[PDB]
């Protein structure tokens, strides 16, 4: 039980940890190639960016 | 004696009132402190940028 | 002249100058000021602008360098020659400048400082100066390119 409740959780968590990888990523490699523009600060803030 | 104290035995509600506000107002008082301290940190971020 | 060069072992370290009421001069640079009668005004540091100011005589007041935040995109002079503001950044051709230049003016085509540099990094054919500058709202902000240098 622990077991398969711990190696779900962990191959949930990874996923899930990879998909919000993958979901920054995608909100920041836009801004990331605009050296200029102004960032929505609500998406500067919940995904990392320097903002200007 | 019939029974056996338990080094809570004394200090009653008035000078558990005073221990808890006093704590408490540090308390406050440090996060107030440290409240400032961050906003000022995020101010300037925006201030900058 | 309106900008003095702070000493050290008789080899100027540090230009600091006077700005819009307050001597300012750079915390990294250690010397005697060149001019007595600011030579021992007690300086306010501020290390978030690595900086120090202090409030010129009564006396000599009236000398002293305007600024102001409204900075366009173009050219401004400075003593070393000509400084460009490009995609808010001045930048400097290479080469020109380095340990001495700290704290020297930059100034418009009226005259008045915007800024005053503190460091550098050579990038490529040209060099980006990490400075103190007015902000849109006439705020002082420190704008350093990344790596950049004490002058």
Request: proline residues 0%.
């Given at each position: 039980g622990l077991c398969t409740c711990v190696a779900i959780i962990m191959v949930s968590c990874v996923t899930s940890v990879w998909l919000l990888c993958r979901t920054r990523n995608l909100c920041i490699t836009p801004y990331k190639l605009a050296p200029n523009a102004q960032v929505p600060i609500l998406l500067a803030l919940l995904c990392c960016i320097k903002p200007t | 004696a019939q029974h056996t104290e338990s080094?809570?035995?004394?200090?009653?509600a008035t000078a558990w009132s005073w221990i808890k506000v006093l704590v408490g107002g540090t308390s406050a008082f440090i996060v107030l402190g440290l409240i400032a301290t961050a906003v000022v940190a995020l101010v300037l971020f925006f201030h900058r940028h | 002249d309106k900008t003095f060069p702070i000493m050290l072992n008789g080899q100027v370290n540090g230009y600091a100058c006077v700005v819009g009421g307050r001597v300012f001069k750079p915390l990294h640079v250690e010397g005697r000021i060149d001019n007595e009668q600011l030579a021992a005004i007690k300086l306010k540091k501020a290390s978030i602008y690595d900086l120090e100011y202090g409030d010129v005589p009564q006396c000599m007041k009236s000398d002293t360098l305007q600024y102001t935040s409204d900075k366009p995109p173009g050219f401004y002079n400075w003593h070393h020659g000509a400084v460009q503001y490009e995609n808010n950044r001045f930048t400097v051709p290479r080469?020109?400048?380095?340990?001495?230049?700290?704290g020297r003016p930059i100034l418009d085509n009226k005259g008045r400082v915007v800024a005053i540099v503190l460091g550098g990094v050579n990038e490529g054919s040209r060099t980006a100066l990490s400075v103190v500058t007015w902000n849109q709202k006439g705020v002082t902000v420190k704008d350093t390119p990344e790596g950049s240098e004490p002058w």
């Open positions: - | 080094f809570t035995s004394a200090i009653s | 080469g020109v400048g380095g340990k001495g230049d700290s």
